[PDB]
Ligand binder design. Sequence first.
Ligand SMILES: [Hg+2]
Ligand SMILES: [Zn+2]
Length: 255
Amino acid sequence: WGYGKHNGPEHWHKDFPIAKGERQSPVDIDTHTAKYDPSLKPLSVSYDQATSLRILNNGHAFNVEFDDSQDKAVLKGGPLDGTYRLIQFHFHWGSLDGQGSEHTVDKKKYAAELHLVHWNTKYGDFGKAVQQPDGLAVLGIFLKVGSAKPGLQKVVDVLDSIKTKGKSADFTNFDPRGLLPESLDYWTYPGSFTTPPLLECVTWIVLKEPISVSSEQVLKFRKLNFNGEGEPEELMVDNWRPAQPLKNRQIKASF
Ligand SMILES: [Hg+2]
Ligand SMILES: [Zn+2]
């Protein structure tokens, strides 16, 4: 599967029939139909003891991986019951600045979207959590082009080391707090992974506030490659899935 004409999102259903299921992601967040729900608790993001281990180009995005063998970087509160551990984050971006996010807001597409992936510790490990309707919680943050995000520069500088599919580089002591916006207001709905296997395991928490990155920071993302070393070069751009039908799910807003 991939993002091209012959293997991109509109073909995915042949190998992963859940693509056409009932709670697929991403979706358009219609701000006027989203229900303010005053029972939504504030999010609690405890990332101060986070341990990053490595960054990896896996052929469809680059992932920063974290040590999830103990409760070091956890998410709780908001719509969640329980503690969700951070296992990795990755981005989706476009070839141009006006596209790249997966989720849209009143049909507006942003330049990129960050997904911080967490699994529910009640289930023991990530592989068991992906068999559950509430096994994962993913935090989505929109990126728009403006001023440089200082906390993103460590990530941008290592990307040369992992240009092609399959390469990885050690990436310790990265603090994920530098990628957070000021406000933690959010929209939340039940959804899925946005890449194969597209399992319907995810409580999505999409933050209202975007972070800004500079044009030169997001340009470095665009130099990555989908291909492995020694294969023809295919630039890793537009690795995002289009919005899916909401199908009688309701988006709740914390604000
Ligand atoms: Hg699931
Ligand atoms: Zn993602």
